[PDB]
Amino acid sequence: QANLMRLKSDLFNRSPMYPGPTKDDPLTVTLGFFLQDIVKVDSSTNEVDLVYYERQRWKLNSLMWDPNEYGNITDFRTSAADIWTPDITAASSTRPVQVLSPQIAVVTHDGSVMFSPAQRLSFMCDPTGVDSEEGVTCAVKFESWVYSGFEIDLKTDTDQVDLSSYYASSKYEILSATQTRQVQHYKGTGEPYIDVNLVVKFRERRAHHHHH
Amino acid sequence: QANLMRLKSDLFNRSPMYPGPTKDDPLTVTLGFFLQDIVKVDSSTNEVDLVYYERQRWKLNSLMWDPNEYGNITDFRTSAADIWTPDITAASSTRPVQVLSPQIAVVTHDGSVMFSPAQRLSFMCDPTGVDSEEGVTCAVKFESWVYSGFEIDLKTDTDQVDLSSYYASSKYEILSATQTRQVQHYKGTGEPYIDVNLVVKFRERRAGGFF
Amino acid sequence: QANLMRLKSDLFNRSPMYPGPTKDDPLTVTLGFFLQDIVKVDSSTNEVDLVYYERQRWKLNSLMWDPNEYGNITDFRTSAADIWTPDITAASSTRPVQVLSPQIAVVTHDGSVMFSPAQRLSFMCDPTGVDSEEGVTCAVKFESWVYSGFEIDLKTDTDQVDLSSYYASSKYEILSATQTRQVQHYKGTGEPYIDVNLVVKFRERR
Amino acid sequence: QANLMRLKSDLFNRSPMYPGPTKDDPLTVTLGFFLQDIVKVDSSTNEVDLVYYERQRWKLNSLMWDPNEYGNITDFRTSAADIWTPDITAASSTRPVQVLSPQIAVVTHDGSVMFSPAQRLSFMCDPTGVDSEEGVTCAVKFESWVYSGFEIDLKTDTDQVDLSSYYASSKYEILSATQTRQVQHYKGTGEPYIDVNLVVKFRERR
Amino acid sequence: QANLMRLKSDLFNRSPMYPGPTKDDPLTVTLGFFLQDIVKVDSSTNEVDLVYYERQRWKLNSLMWDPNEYGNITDFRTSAADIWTPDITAASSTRPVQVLSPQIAVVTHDGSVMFSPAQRLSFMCDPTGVDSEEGVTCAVKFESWVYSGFEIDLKTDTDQVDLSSYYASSKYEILSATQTRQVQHYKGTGEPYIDVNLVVKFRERRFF
Ligand SMILES: [Cl-]
Ligand SMILES: [Cl-]
Ligand SMILES: [Cl-]
Ligand SMILES: [Cl-]
Ligand SMILES: [Cl-]
């Protein structure tokens, strides 16, 4: 308790917060998607609702410490308000993303941050053909809304979306689910930016006592 | 009033907040569920909505005091913002949990904290067969989202969900309701983590029902 | 303006906030319900929606002052964030209560606080029979979620719910509406706690 | 920029906020409604949804300044959080009011404040007869939730609701729309309070 | 990291925030709309729902710096809470606008600010005729809610709404989409104010 209090005090109260990347000090954020359910499909509005969590990893020198100086603490948990987090946005959402997990991150002695927000997302998807063998395919790009490719790079460890927590009794069966890094260019300023394109192909399933 | 003001001042304004558990100083959180209603079932989205409250208990040395030093105060109530609370999460929720009770906890002179949030939860459940005698079974795991089993352990006092506040005129009759501690392992990591599995077996209310 | 600024400064900035009742210094909260409408009835989910306001009264020595010392001010209005308020909860709600009025209370020179939140509440109610002469009865208990009867007592001034603001053209006609203090015990006779039971008997209007 | 920074610093950082009216220093608030649409009518719940904006005007000595001392600035815009605003409430709402405009007010050198919140409101209204020639009438009272008539008075500049921004292709046609000051009396208290009664007569478009 | 920390500290902690424009120091805000989808149409309430993002640009002397004094930093990203932003409002909305993007802006060494909020908007629109060839036309004015034309001017770089991110499989096909500056006058005070009128002509999606 006491060593961790010191560690957090040293990291967060002494110095200000990481202000974000720049051209001279860019940052790489690694993303992985863990799809849990296709909850809803709306053929009258062409909206589909996903529940997933999104593993995000990055690394900052400012969050390094020597474990020997803090009782051999190698990592800790702390509110996401205590740190900078990347502004990763679903570019074709139709409602604000709903947060399903606590806004808490894991910080490791080398300055690695892991943040794994669970989300419910409504996004643009025509579900016509979902009730067939071939099913339907839909896509959503995840990107930093404000940083170019000169400041932020996004990558994946694998192009396969993890389906190991996918709900076994979902209304919808997943045929294919990929997460692919792409290079893109803004309209008015033509400078590059990175996205990770989530492409999911799916179809309807077939074969002294108180407290109150 | 005056003694309590001193007590809260001494506990909360002197020291910073408990920063959470670590490998060297882990924490045990005890959970108990008090199911009040199955409000809704949606067969087109495979979502079911529960209303319950969840008794949570844990213990911290930093919240100890000697009652003799504070006018024989043995316990007090305080806003949950004044203290650390565990990040217990329904792992198969489909909407943010809605809070139905005040965010207030009870702290006791030995450093025990009791926090009993009432919640409405939407979660993943195929209700096909709910309109039969046998009914349907659904499950939801409750776990710390960010702490492994090295930092947080979860347990129960009993594996039976309390149904004593269950709505007598619910659309749904509870046939069985259990809360069972389970050991689990993360995919990429491989290190262990604990959940409490809430398993509820229910059906649409009928006169009476296997004869 | 100036005298009130002094008064609020003296009450709120000098001392900390009232920390809540204890066994040695318990508190009595008086409740009164003013039912305005039964807005919705859902027979598929057994939920009913009420709109009402709820008069709450309590009294603290820490909020007393002598009017002579503050330009004869007998009472004032202030944000509910400036003071402690009781944690009165509908025990069978199914959604978070929606707030329909400003979170502002009235404080009086004797230390009386009056807080009258307007609310929309969804709660557990089987409405089967609402479309008959006899109608249907539903109940919801209002209680402190965290305080026992040793710390908080609840009472009413009358056991009759006030229907003087009840919407004349509601879909639902009120046959009876009562608010009754009850003594209760946590689980298998644990320590006591108080609730006010709101019982409303109603039917479709003719 | 610099003069305005000084002005705001002088008004908001030196003195505390206006604490609200009292019996000895009451306040007059003028209201005007600008009805933009009847968006929805629900005959199963007797709820109707309006979109409008509400001009509110009041005056405080504490917000006066001499323009000559601040580069001839006669008025400015500032966040509503920087000032006191009246607690004007629709008394028969069924959902929390949704805010459609930025919470920003206009302050003028004589201490006049203009605040014009756009709102979407659900309120109690039986729409039976809306699909006829005569249409239907509905009413909603706007009042301070916590202040009596001894502390707050409400007035209008005209008893005619402004329909100049009313949506030309609404589902509903407005036949008449009035805003009328009324004197009222509390149940338990008996002391007076003021409301402005918004009465709208409308029907389905033909 | 260190130079940017200094820059932000110098701009935001030393001086107070820009207090907004005045008659003597007015501000020009340039708007551009990027329509992404017509999500919904409700013929029973005459409401239509758009998803778009809105590029906003303005310029303040108080946000200037010399890049040479801050490790050649030419621009940075920062929370919109750190700065003044214009109060641009859809005048015929029927629900609060829902925010779909992070509230973060880009500031450039000359004092230019770019803020590009993605929004979902419900607004007043009779969709009768949407299921025909000719389709239907709807309009929504975007304006400062509180500032007159003496304090705020709005303009566009083009009168064509950008449709390059418009969802190819939307229920609704865009026939035409324009963004036009207009001069307007308040009722009681007869002084001018500016809006940008977004006019969208569309129809339900449909050679054999
Ligand atoms: Cl950081
Ligand atoms: Cl703590
Ligand atoms: Cl208090
Ligand atoms: Cl003020
Ligand atoms: Cl600024």
DSSP calls for chain E? -HHHHHHHIIIIIIS-------SSS-EEEEEEEEEEEEEEEETTTTEEEEEEEEEEEEEEEEEE--GGGGTT--EEEEEGGGS----EEETTBSSPPEE-S-SEEEEETEEEEEE--EEEEEEE---TTTTSSS-EEEEEEEEESS--TTTEEEE-S-SBPB-TTS-TT-SEEEEEEEEEEEEEE-SSS--EEEEEEEEEEEEE----
Give the CA dihedral A41, A36, A29, A85, nearest 10 degrees: 80
The 8-class DSSP code of residue B7 comes to H
Looking at the partner chain, which of B46, B87, B96 has a beta carbon nearest the beta carbon of A99? B96
- CA-nearest of C190, C86, C192 to C142 is C86
Q: Pairing relation of β-strands A27-42 and C192-204?
A: unpaired
CA distance A26 to A143: 15
Q: Give one word for B142, left, alpha or beta, with left for phi > 0 and alpha for psi -120 to 50.
A: beta
The 8-class DSSP code of residue A5 comes to H
- CA-nearest of E66, E111, E65, E121 to E91 is E121
Tokens encoding E85: 């932003």
Kind plus residue range of the DSSP H or E element containing B5: helix B2-8
Distance D194 CA to ligand 4 centre (A): 22
CA distance D50 to D139: 11
Cβ-based neighbours of B150, under 8 Å, separated by 6 or more: B23, B26, B191, B192
Phi, psi of B7 (to 5 degrees): -60, -50
- CA-nearest of B138, B106, B116 to B125 is B138
CA distance E166 to E37: 6
Q: Is A184 exposed, middle or buried (0-12, 13-18, 19+ CB in 10 A)?
A: middle
The SS3 assignment for A25 reads coil
Q: Pairing relation of β-strands C27-42 and C152-155?
A: parallel
The 8-class DSSP code of residue A28 comes to E
CB crowding E118-157: b at 16 or more within 10 Å, else e: bbbbbbbbbbeebeeeebbebebbbbbbbbbbebbbbebe
Tokens encoding E145: 């809610």
- CA-nearest of A93, A198, A189, A112 to A149 is A189
CA distance E92 to D53: 11
Chain D residues with beta carbon closer than 8 angstroms to that of E25: 1
Nearest-Cα residue of chain D relative to residue E61: D1
SS (H, E, C) chain C: CHHHHHHHHHHHHHCCCCCCCCCCCCEEEEEEEEEEEEEEEECCCCEEEEEEEEEEEEEEEEEECCHHHHCCCCEEEEEHHHCCCCCEEECCECCCCEECCCCEEEEECEEEEEECCEEEEEEECCCCCCCCCCCEEEEEEEEECCCCCCCEEEECCCCECECCCCCCCCCEEEEEEEEEEEEEECCCCCCEEEEEEEEEEEEECC
Contact status, residue C200 vs residue C174, Cβ threshold 8 Å? yes
Kind plus residue range of the DSSP H or E element containing D24: none
Contact status, residue C54 vs residue C180, Cβ threshold 8 Å? no
Contact status, residue B2 vs residue B8, Cβ threshold 8 Å? no
- CA-nearest of E140, E196, E179 to E34 is E179
- CA-nearest of D57, D70, D86 to D1 is D70
Distance from CA of E36 to the nearest CA of A (A): 8
Phi, psi of B8 (to 5 degrees): -65, -40
- CA-nearest of C19, C171, C5 to C86 is C19
CA distance D95 to C120: 7
Contact status, residue A51 vs residue A100, Cβ threshold 8 Å? yes
Residue that has been written with the tokens 């206006």 in this structure: D18
- CA-nearest of D9, D103, D27, D26 to D65 is D9
Judged by CB atoms closer than 8 Å, whether chains meet at E76 and A22 is answered as yes
SS (H, E, C) B111-124: EEEEECCEEEEEEE
Task: Say how many C-beta atoms besides its own lie within 10 A of residue D38's C-beta.
Answer: 27
Residue that has been written with the tokens 């213990």 in this structure: B59
Contact status, residue E12 vs residue E139, Cβ threshold 8 Å? no
- The residues facing E107 across adjacent strands are E76, E113
Tokens encoding E76: 């940075």
The SS3 assignment for B11 reads helix
CA distance B69 to E79: 47
CA distance C91 to C95: 11
The 8-class DSSP code of residue D96 comes to P
Contact status, residue A56 vs residue A101, Cβ threshold 8 Å? no
CA distance D116 to D162: 14
Kind plus residue range of the DSSP H or E element containing D169: none
SS (H, E, C) D50-93: EEEEEEEEEEEEEEECCHHHHCCCCEEEEEHHHCCCCCEEECCE
CA distance B171 to D203: 39
Kind plus residue range of the DSSP H or E element containing A7: helix A2-8
The length of chain E in residues reads 208
- CA-nearest of E36, D50, B189, B114 to A90 is E36
Contact status, residue A161 vs residue A200, Cβ threshold 8 Å? yes
- Chains touching D, CB cut-off 8 Å, 3+ pairs: C, E
CA distance E38 to B110: 59
Distance from CA of A97 to the nearest CA of B (A): 10
Residue type, A47: E
Judged by CB atoms closer than 8 Å, whether chains meet at D146 and C71 is answered as no
Sign of torsion over alpha carbons E131, E135, E137, E138 = positive
Residue that has been written with the tokens 């959970």 in this structure: B31
CATH of domain B1-211: 2.70.170.10
Tokens encoding A145: 């809304």
Give chain B's end-to-end CA distance (angstroms, integer). 61
Give chain D's end-to-end CA distance (angstroms, integer). 53
CA distance B47 to B180: 22
Q: Pairing relation of β-strands D98-99 and A104-108?
A: unpaired
The 8-class DSSP code of residue B69 comes to G
Distance D113 CA to ligand 4 centre (A): 9
- Longest CA–CA separation in chain D, Å: 61
Residue type, A127: P
Q: Is E171 exposed, middle or buried (0-12, 13-18, 19+ CB in 10 A)?
A: buried
Tokens encoding E186: 């308040």
Q: Give one word for A7, left, alpha or beta, with left for phi > 0 and alpha for psi -120 to 50.
A: alpha
CATH of domain E1-208: 2.70.170.10
Within chain D, residue ranges assigned H as helices are 2-8
CB crowding A53-78: b at 16 or more within 10 Å, else e: bbbbbbebeebebeeeebeebebbbb
Domain boundaries, chain E: 1-208
Looking at the partner chain, which of C25, C89, C92 has a beta carbon nearest the beta carbon of B36? C92
Contact status, residue B36 vs residue B102, Cβ threshold 8 Å? no
Looking at domain A1-212, its CATH superfamily turns out to be Neurotransmitter-gated ion-channel ligand-binding domain (2.70.170.10)
Rg for chain B (alpha carbons), in Å?
Answer: 20
- CA-nearest of C144, C78, C129 to C108 is C78
Question: How far from chain centre, in Å, is Cα B151?
Answer: 18
- CA-nearest of A196, A205, A171 to A49 is A171
Looking at the partner chain, which of E8, E32, E34 has a beta carbon nearest the beta carbon of A19? E8
- Number of Cα atoms under 13 Å in the Cβ half of residue A74: 4
Q: Give one word for E37, left, alpha or beta, with left for phi > 0 and alpha for psi -120 to 50.
A: beta
CA distance E195 to B70: 64
Question: How far from chain centre, in Å, is Cα E161?
Answer: 12
Judged by CB atoms closer than 8 Å, whether chains meet at A209 and C193 is answered as no
Phi, psi of B192 (to 5 degrees): -75, 155
CA distance C70 to C65: 8
Judged by CB atoms closer than 8 Å, whether chains meet at D92 and C169 is answered as no
Cβ-based neighbours of D38, under 8 Å, separated by 6 or more: D48, D49, D50, D170, D171, D172, D174, D200, D202
Give the CA dihedral C32, C36, C38, C39, nearest 10 degrees: -130
CB crowding D159-193: b at 16 or more within 10 Å, else e: eebbeebbbeebbbebeebbbeeeeeeeeeeeeeb
Q: Pairing relation of β-strands C110-115 and C104-108?
A: antiparallel
Residue D185 counted as an annotated binding residue: yes
Contact status, residue B126 vs residue B181, Cβ threshold 8 Å? no
Phi, psi of A70 (to 5 degrees): -140, 50
Distance from CA of B183 to the nearest CA of C (A): 30
Residue type, B42: D
Contact status, residue D148 vs residue D189, Cβ threshold 8 Å? yes
Residue type, D108: T
Looking at the partner chain, which of C145, C146, C191 has a beta carbon nearest the beta carbon of A209? C191
Cβ-based neighbours of B160, under 8 Å, separated by 6 or more: B177, B178, B179
CATH for C1-206, among 3.40.1180.10, 2.160.10.10, 3.80.10.10, 2.70.170.10? 2.70.170.10
Give the CA dihedral C146, C151, C156, C162, nearest 10 degrees: -30
Q: Beta strands of chain D (E only): which ranges? A: 27-42, 47-64, 75-79, 88-90, 98-99, 104-108, 110-115, 118-124, 136-144, 152-155, 172-185, 192-204
Tokens encoding D88: 């004007």
The 8-class DSSP code of residue A131 comes to T
Which approach determined this entry? X-ray
Resolution in A: 2.6
CA distances from D138 to B123, C35, C169, D201, E154 (A): 41, 20, 11, 6, 39
- CA-nearest of D83, D79, D59 to D11 is D83
Judged by CB atoms closer than 8 Å, whether chains meet at C164 and D187 is answered as yes
CA distance C61 to C70: 17
Cβ-based neighbours of D190, under 8 Å, separated by 6 or more: none
- CA-nearest of E17, E13, E15, E6 to E73 is E6
- Number of Cα atoms under 13 Å in the Cβ half of residue E107: 26
